[PDB]
Amino acid sequence: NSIAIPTNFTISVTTEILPVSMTKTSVDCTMYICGDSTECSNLLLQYGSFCTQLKRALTGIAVEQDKNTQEVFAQVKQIYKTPPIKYFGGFNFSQILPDPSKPSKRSPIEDLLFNKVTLICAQKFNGLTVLPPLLTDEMIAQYTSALLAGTITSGWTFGAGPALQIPFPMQMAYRFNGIGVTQNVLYENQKLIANQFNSAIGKIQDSLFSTPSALGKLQDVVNHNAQALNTLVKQLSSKFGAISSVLNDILSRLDPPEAEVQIDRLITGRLQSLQTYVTQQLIRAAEIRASANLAATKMSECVLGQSKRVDFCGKGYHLMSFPQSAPHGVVFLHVTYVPAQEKNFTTAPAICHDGKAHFPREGVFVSNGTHWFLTQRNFYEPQIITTDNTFVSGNCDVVIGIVNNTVYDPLQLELDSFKEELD
Amino acid sequence: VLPPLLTDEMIAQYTSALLAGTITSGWTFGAGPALQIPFPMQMAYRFNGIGVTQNVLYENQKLIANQFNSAIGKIQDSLFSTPSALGKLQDVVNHNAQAL
Amino acid sequence: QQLIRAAEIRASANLAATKMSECVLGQSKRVDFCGKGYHLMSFPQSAPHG
Amino acid sequence: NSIAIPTNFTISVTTEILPVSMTKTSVDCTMYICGDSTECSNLLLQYGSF
Amino acid sequence: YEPQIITTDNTFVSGNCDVVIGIVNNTVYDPLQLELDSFKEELD
Amino acid sequence: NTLVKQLSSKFGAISSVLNDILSRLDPPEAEVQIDRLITGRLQSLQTYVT
Amino acid sequence: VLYQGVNCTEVSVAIHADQLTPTWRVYSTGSNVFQTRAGCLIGAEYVNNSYECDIPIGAGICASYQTQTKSQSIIAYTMSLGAENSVAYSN
Ligand SMILES: *[C@@H]1O[C@H](CO)[C@@H](O[C@@H]2O[C@H](CO)[C@@H](O[C@@H]3O[C@H](CO)[C@@H](O)[C@H](O)[C@@H]3O)[C@H](O)[C@H]2NC(C)=O)[C@H](O)[C@H]1NC(C)=O
Ligand SMILES: *[C@@H]1O[C@H](CO)[C@@H](O[C@@H]2O[C@H](CO)[C@@H](O[C@@H]3O[C@H](CO)[C@@H](O)[C@H](O)[C@@H]3O)[C@H](O)[C@H]2NC(C)=O)[C@H](O)[C@H]1NC(C)=O
Ligand SMILES: *[C@@H]1O[C@H](CO)[C@@H](O[C@@H]2O[C@H](CO)[C@@H](O[C@@H]3O[C@H](CO)[C@@H](O)[C@H](O)[C@@H]3O)[C@H](O)[C@H]2NC(C)=O)[C@H](O)[C@H]1NC(C)=O
Ligand SMILES: *[C@@H]1O[C@H](CO)[C@@H](O[C@@H]2O[C@H](CO)[C@@H](O)[C@H](O)[C@H]2NC(C)=O)[C@H](O)[C@H]1NC(C)=O
Ligand SMILES: *[C@@H]1O[C@H](CO)[C@@H](O[C@@H]2O[C@H](CO)[C@@H](O)[C@H](O)[C@H]2NC(C)=O)[C@H](O)[C@H]1NC(C)=O
Ligand SMILES: *[C@@H]1O[C@H](CO)[C@@H](O[C@@H]2O[C@H](CO)[C@@H](O)[C@H](O)[C@H]2NC(C)=O)[C@H](O)[C@H]1NC(C)=O
Ligand SMILES: *[C@@H]1O[C@H](CO)[C@@H](O)[C@H](O)[C@H]1NC(C)=O
Numbered sequence: 080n081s082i083a084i085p086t087n088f089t090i091s092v093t094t095e096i097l098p099v100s101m102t103k104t105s106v107d108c109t110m111y112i113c114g115d116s117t118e119c120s121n122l123l124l125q126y127g128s129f130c131t132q133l134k135r136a137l138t139g140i141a142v143e144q145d146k147n148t149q150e151v152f153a154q155v156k157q158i159y160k161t162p163p164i165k166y167f168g169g170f171n172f173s174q175i176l177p178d179p180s181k182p183s184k185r186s187p188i189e190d191l192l193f194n195k196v197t198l199i200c201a202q203k204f205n206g207l208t209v210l211p212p213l214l215t216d217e218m219i220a221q222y223t224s225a226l227l228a229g230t231i232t233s234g235w236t237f238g239a240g241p242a243l244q245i246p247f248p249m250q251m252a253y254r255f256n257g258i259g260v261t262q263n264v265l266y267e268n269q270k271l272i273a274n275q276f277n278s279a280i281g282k283i284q285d286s287l288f289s290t291p292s293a294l295g296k297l298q299d300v301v302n303h304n305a306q307a308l309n310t311l312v313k314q315l316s317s318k319f320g321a322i323s324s325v326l327n328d329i330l331s332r333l334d335p336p337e338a339e340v341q342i343d344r345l346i347t348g349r350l351q352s353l354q355t356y357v358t359q360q361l362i363r364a365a366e367i368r369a370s371a372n373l374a375a376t377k378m379s380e381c382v383l384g385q386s387k388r389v390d391f392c393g394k395g396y397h398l399m400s401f402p403q404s405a406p407h408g409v410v411f412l413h414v415t416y417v418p419a420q421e422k423n424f425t426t427a428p429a430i431c432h433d434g435k436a437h438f439p440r441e442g443v444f445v446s447n448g449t450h451w452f453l454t455q456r457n458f459y460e461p462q463i464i465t466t467d468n469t470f471v472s473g474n475c476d477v478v479i480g481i482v483n484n485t486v487y488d489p490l491q492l493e494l495d496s497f498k499e500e501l502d
Numbered sequence: 503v504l505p506p507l508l509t510d511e512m513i514a515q516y517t518s519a520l521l522a523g524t525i526t527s528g529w530t531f532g533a534g535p536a537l538q539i540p541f542p543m544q545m546a547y548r549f550n551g552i553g554v555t556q557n558v559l560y561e562n563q564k565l566i567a568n569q570f571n572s573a574i575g576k577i578q579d580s581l582f583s584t585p586s587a588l589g590k591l592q593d594v595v596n597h598n599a600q601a602l
Numbered sequence: 603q604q605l606i607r608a609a610e611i612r613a614s615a616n617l618a619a620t621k622m623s624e625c626v627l628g629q630s631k632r633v634d635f636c637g638k639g640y641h642l643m644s645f646p647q648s649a650p651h652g
Numbered sequence: 653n654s655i656a657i658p659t660n661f662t663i664s665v666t667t668e669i670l671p672v673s674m675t676k677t678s679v680d681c682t683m684y685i686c687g688d689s690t691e692c693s694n695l696l697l698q699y700g701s702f
Numbered sequence: 703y704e705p706q707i708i709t710t711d712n713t714f715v716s717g718n719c720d721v722v723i724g725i726v727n728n729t730v731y732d733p734l735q736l737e738l739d740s741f742k743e744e745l746d
Numbered sequence: 747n748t749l750v751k752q753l754s755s756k757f758g759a760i761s762s763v764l765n766d767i768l769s770r771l772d773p774p775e776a777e778v779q780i781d782r783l784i785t786g787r788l789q790s791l792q793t794y795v796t
Numbered sequence: 797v798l799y800q801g802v803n804c805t806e807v808s809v810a811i812h813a814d815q816l817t818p819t820w821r822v823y824s825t826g827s828n829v830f831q832t833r834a835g836c837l838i839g840a841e842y843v844n845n846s847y848e849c850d851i852p853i854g855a856g857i858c859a860s861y862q863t864q865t866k867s868q869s870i871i872a873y874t875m876s877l878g879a880e881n882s883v884a885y886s887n
């Protein structure tokens with residue numbers, strides 16, 4: 080017969096950092112294998128379509144990377160703007176909304192994310208090039224801003240039809256109903272909730288600034304791609320058992336037949352290095368695609384809605400989420416309701432009044448040791464047990480652990496204070 | 503072959519912690535602090551969650567507890583008598599051994 | 603082959619973790635996600651490699 | 653105008669089995685290719701960072 | 703949109719009028735008092 | 747379509763047809779030319795399966 | 797034709813010097829040579845008007861085939877992301 084019920088709460092904001100896309104590379108098979116060598120290219124032509132297959136695989140990956148970014152961020156029909164006056168019930172969004180004074184309209188948090196993660200083809204060039212993304216960082220920032228403006232000014236309505244404006248405190252009140260907490264909890268505590276939110280956002284900035292490992296997930300993608308290209312360039316140095324790693328020295332020192340044999344050995348080594356690179360890129364691309372699909376799912380369900388999936392949109396009961404862009408990825412700020420300061424109460428399945436068994440409609444029966452009250456489950460708020468708060472089914476002889484307590488009826492209580500005169 | 507970081511005993515301990523939390527506090531522990539609740543009331547809320555009123559559970563609490571206990575016994579009989587039941591995990595082992 | 607099968611295992615582990623959070627640490631409204639029927643609750647058990 | 657409504661219920665328990673992890677192997681590249689052979693190893697170094 | 707009269711059956715009461723920011727003044731209709739005042743309305 | 751097309755490649759061999767290699771050359775040179783074709787076709791199958 | 801990863805000056809010099817490996821040449825007027833981050837785009841007229849992306853080029857720039865002041869040609873533009881909609885938010 081013992082239940083614990085929260086008497087307070089904390090608004091918590093957490094970060095979830097997900098890769099969305101990876102560097103889009105392109106490789107000139109012939110130039111990589113046969114660096115300005117006619118004899119090598121002519122030998123390379125005898126191996127078949129391998130260069131074509133490698134080109135197609137990398138093209139498919141590059142297209143996939145643009146698809147992944149578009150599916151994660153281009154989820155809004157219109158580019159939404161916040162009102163000129165950034166007053167949202169006392170909730171301070173200045174650290175998530177774009178700062179209009181900068182050359183790139185990014186939020187302070189976005190500036191941090193872009194600064195922590197790190198036409199001259201300076202890096203690893205041997206016929207190996209890097210293609211730009213279809214959407215620029217400014218365009219991604221515009222999609223993120225549109226999503227924030229939509230969520231802040233219209234809640235989830237912009238994600239399932241036209242955007243419908245709602246006062247922000249009423250949006251939060253509905254989110255509270257979504258997690259099983261009545262509207263009066265938020266309205267009575269609106270200043271506390273806004274202050275906890277603003278504090279949590281400041282903590283997000285300090286967490287990302289002071290903990291370099293938080294963004295490791297995105298940095299690792301960059302580092303892995305850099306290693307792949309670095310390795311691929313290093314593979315040109317290897318001899319693979321040939322007389323020399325330099326193709327021009329093979330042609331310069333040896334006669335055509337033996338030179339062709341040594342060249343064929345270099346062709347095998349370089350071609351296998353390209354096949355290894357492409358295979359690793361396809362596996363990594365599949366991993367990135369899965370991450371992008373998860374990020375798009377969390378964009379739709381966490382940002383353009385309210386989710387009842389446990390731990391999907393952060394730890395605690397989900398209230399709302401806000402996207403932020405990052406290099407090659409997305410960071411979600413998940414705002415959740417966390418119960419706090421629980422108290423021990425005695426409980427009972429039902430109240431026995433006149434022999435009828437009374438069950439709560441929306442709540443749990445609790446006792447402070449002297450009186451029975453009905454409370455909401457996620458926030459202690461004692462109420463008088465009445466016939467409106469409860470429903471009746473069966474009698475006191477069926478329910479195990481039923482307790483004897485008075486259920487008050489207003490109508491027969493007021494009849495008692497109204498018709499007593501009998502005249 | 504390198505050993506796992508978490509031993510079979512440590513995995514069992516995490517599983518035990520998860521079972522103790524769910525049984526004694528329902529979903530309150532997943533969302534934050536673990537708040538004790540009588541088990542039949544946790545079930546009453548789960549029934550309400552699926553659109554069945556609380557009185558159905560309380561009126562039929564003995565029947566429900568008996569059906570649960572019988573279902574668990576059936577789980578043991580099913581796993582014991584059907585060697586293929588765990589094939590998904592055995593296949594992983596076989597796939598790695600075959601590769602080596 | 604190990605990288606491809608590791609990716610398969612990772613996807614399975616991600617599904618198992620999702621089910622752990624939504625089926626064991628909560629009550630799910632997703633049809634057939636946490637078994638057939640209307641979901642009431644779930645209990646994990648350890649198994650070799652899973 | 654016809655609707656069917658349950659008058660009773662069954663509590664059912666089902667199993668879901670998921671892989672979580674796979675065997676963590678480790679391979680000594682040099683011993684596998686050129687085991688206990690210096691002469692072979694000196695050629696293995698010429699194939700790059702395999 | 704489907705407007706209905708605001709009554710004591712449609713709303714719930716918690717707290718006074720000073721704590722909520724942006725509260726407005728409007729009549730909330732109670733069906734039971736109007737009848738019950740009617741039940742002893744003529745006092746005969 | 748690509749895998750069948752790979753059968754026409756030489757991969758450094760004199761010809762893509764095993765019967766021409768066997769008919770024109772002596773056994774050990776023919777064996778070298780056949781290994782060149784086997785390596786190419788086997789690599790093509792490994793690519794297809796991957 | 798998009799020459800990826802290079803400056804339009806380097807490409808223009810390579811055509812005048814006959815240094816490029818492709819043997820075909822794209823007629824240039826100087827009004828149809830536009831420098832993008834993806835590379836040098838020769839044979840398309842860049843316009844200020846933003847449109848929905850059709851044929852992607854890269855780094856925000858897309859191209860399409862449209863009638864220009866009554867005469868059709870390939871144009872390049874910075875893609876539009878969507879219509880702008882300011883929500884009438886108030887207390
Ligand atoms: C929303 O929160 C941000 C902080 O996260 C507020 O920005 C801060 O605003 C103050 C001015 O009110 C800025 O100046 C400060 O002034 C004091 C004066 O004593 C000085 O001691 C400080 O060193 C600082 O100069 C402050 O720099 C600024 N901080 C940031 C990060 O922008 C913002 O005003 C809040 N908005 C609302 C509507 O509450
Ligand atoms: C529920 O928990 C919140 C905290 O999460 C409680 O609000 C906090 O109450 C304490 C004490 O009343 C405040 O500390 C005081 O702050 C003033 C600021 O000027 C300072 O001068 C005092 O010396 C003291 O440090 C704290 O700031 C306040 N936090 C917030 C965000 O408002 C709340 O009272 C709790 N409610 C219940 C019913 O337990
Ligand atoms: C709803 O279904 C449950 C079964 O899932 C019904 O309970 C079952 O009722 C039958 C007949 O009353 C019980 O069988 C009898 O069991 C006694 C045990 O001593 C035996 O001596 C009899 O010969 C007979 O086999 C059965 O055990 C019982 N099952 C459980 C788990 O209690 C229940 O009555 C159904 N309710 C309605 C309203 O249909
Ligand atoms: C349980 O709650 C009731 C209701 O608040 C407490 O009784 C009230 O106590 C206040 C003083 O704090 C009195 O002014 C009220 O008149 C009391 N009301 C009634 C109906 O008795 C009761 O004391 C609480 N019990 C415990 C153990 O805390
Ligand atoms: C709740 O009240 C009922 C009476 O309305 C109690 O039932 C009585 O319990 C006494 C115990 O000595 C018996 O002698 C009576 O015969 C019972 N009467 C009936 C009609 O059941 C019931 O025990 C009370 N429960 C609690 C927990 O106090
Ligand atoms: C709702 O009505 C109450 C009166 O029933 C208003 O309260 C009065 O407000 C005036 C404002 O000048 C004060 O001078 C009175 O002393 C207040 N009286 C009481 C009893 O509070 C209240 O302001 C009204 N609210 C709105 C939003 O119109
Ligand atoms: C092209 O070169 C000129 C100088 O010749 C330079 O000013 C310009 O910025 C370069 N453009 C790009 C895109 O690199």
Ligand SMILES: *[C@@H]1O[C@H](CO)[C@@H](O)[C@H](O)[C@H]1NC(C)=O
Binds near residue numbers: 083421422423
């Ligand atoms: C409830 O009572 C138990 C008694 O052992 C105690 O350990 C626990 O901390 C109490 N919880 C609260 C919230 O008071």
Ligand SMILES: *[C@@H]1O[C@H](CO)[C@@H](O)[C@H](O)[C@H]1NC(C)=O
Binds near residue numbers: 164166886887
């Ligand atoms: C909303 O309330 C704030 C309170 O500070 C006020 O400054 C702002 O102008 C109000 N907005 C409207 C549209 O009334």
